[PDB]
C-alpha cells in the first residue's frame, strides 16, 4: 500500500511534534534524577 497523496505541511508538523514531546518527558526524568544525585544521599544509586 502506498500514499495516494502527499501529506500536507501542517499535519506533518503535528505528527512530528508528537514525536518531539517524548523529549519533554525524558527531560523531566533527567531533571529529577539529577536532583537526586545532587544530594549524595542515595544508596540505591552510584556514579563514578
Amino acid at each position: 500500500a502506498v500514499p495516494k497523496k502527499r501529506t500536507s505541511i501542517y499535519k506533518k508538523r503535528i505528527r512530528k511534534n508528537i514525536w518531539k514531546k517524548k523529549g519533554y518527558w525524558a527531560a523531566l526524568k533527567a531533571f529529577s534524577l539529577a536532583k537526586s544525585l545532587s544530594t549524595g544521599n542515595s544508596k540505591s544509586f552510584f556514579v563514578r
Binding site: 514525536w19 525524558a26 531533571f31 539529577a34
Partner: protein
C-alpha cells in the same frame, strides 16, 4: 539602540552530524531554561544529540563570561534554533538492480544566551511606577533620556510598545 546588543551572546555550531529532527527534539526542551538546569539536564539525557549540544552550550556560556562580562548564574537560553546543513548523499544497491539514496544530514545550531540582570535597574524602577506616575516622570526628561530609560526590555515585556508611540512619547 537595541536590547540585542546588550544582553546577548550568540554561538553557532556548524556542521554537527546530528540530523535536524533528532537535534530539534533536544533543543526544544532547553529553550527558555536557566543555564544551570540546562547543564544538568543535558548531562543526563538519553539522546546522542545531547552531547554535542552540551559542548556547544558550555562554550557559549564561557563566551559570555570571558568576552562580554556576564555572570553565569544569570544566563538563560533565550533563543535556540536548528537549521539544516550540507547533506551528503551516497548510493547503495537494493534488491534486483535497484538503487537507493542515503542522506547523511548535518545541521547548524544557534544558541543565544541572554542575561536577565542586565537592565534590571530601569526594569524594577519602571515596575515601581504606576501607569500615570511614569508618564508624569517622562514629562521632564529630554528626548535623549526618554530614549535612554525606555530602551530596556521593559516596553516588550509589558507590551506597551504601540501604546507609547501613540501617546506621542517617542519619535521613530
Amino acid at each position: 539602540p537595541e536590547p540585542g546588543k546588550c544582553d546577548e551572546i550568540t554561538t553557532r555550531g556548524y556542521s554537527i552530524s546530528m540530523s535536524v529532527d533528532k537535534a530539534r527534539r533536544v533543543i526544544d526542551q532547553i529553550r527558555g531554561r536557566s543555564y544551570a538546569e540546562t547543564l544538568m539536564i543535558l548531562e543526563l539525557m538519553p539522546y546522542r544529540a545531547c552531547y554535542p549540544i552540551f559542548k556547544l552550550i558550555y562554550s557559549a556560556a564561557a563566551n559570555a563570561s570571558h568576552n562580554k562580562q556576564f555572570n553565569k548564574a544569570n544566563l538563560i537560553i533565550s533563543k535556540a534554533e536548528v537549521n539544516k546543513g550540507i547533506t551528503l548523499k551516497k548510493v547503495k544497491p537494493r534488491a534486483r538492480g535497484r538503487s537507493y539514496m542515503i542522506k547523511r544530514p548535518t545541521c547548524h545550531i544557534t544558541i543565544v544566551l541572554r542575561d536577565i540582570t542586565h537592565f534590571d535597574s530601569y526594569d524594577k524602577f519602571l515596575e515601581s511606577l504606576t501607569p500615570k506616575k511614569l508618564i508624569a516622570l517622562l514629562g521632564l526628561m529630554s528626548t535623549g533620556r526618554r530614549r535612554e530609560l525606555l530602551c530596556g526590555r521593559f516596553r516588550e515585556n509589558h507590551k506597551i510598545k504601540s501604546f507609547l508611540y501613540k501617546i506621542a512619547l517617542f519619535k521613530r
